[PDB]
Design a protein around this nucleic acid. Sequence first.
DNA 1: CCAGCGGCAGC
DNA 2: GCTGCGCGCTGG
Length: 144
Amino acid sequence: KWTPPRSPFNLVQETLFHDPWKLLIATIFLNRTSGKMAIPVLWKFLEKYPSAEVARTADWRDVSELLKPLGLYDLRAKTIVKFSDEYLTKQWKYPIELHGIGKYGNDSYRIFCVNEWKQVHPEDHKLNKYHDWLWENHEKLSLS
DNA sequence: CCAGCGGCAGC
DNA sequence: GCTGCGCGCTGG
Ligand SMILES: [Cl-]
Ligand code: NA
């Protein structure tokens, strides 16, 4: 029932919130990488690996071939496979407990995937813009 | 032309 | 705290 509102800042989290694995994959794609380049590659990745169930079985070299033009391609290919494994087989309440997700991915999860944005204190240029705007407008957006 | 820039783990 | 990973875009 939690739907995060669309904002004037067009965070890709706003469209991926319904599938936490895809949202978290997107945050990994945005590690020191511009969204203008990363997000078109994200759709190619999700076409080949539509779920964590299959991503945890992937050969990281195949993933790295897709990530090549984004940089950090071997590093994040290995991260994506291990992250997808832990996402499905490790006990967790928040995704910061999982390999490859830190404060930025975790803050994204707690703003977009669950209704905990009032408890989040982001330190990310894009998250701050969205989160400040939410604090300033939540009453007019029929929120609590 | 070319330096700066768009998280996370491991140590 | 500190460093390795890393491509293409950006803009003076
Ligand atoms: Cl972002
Ligand atoms: Na983590």
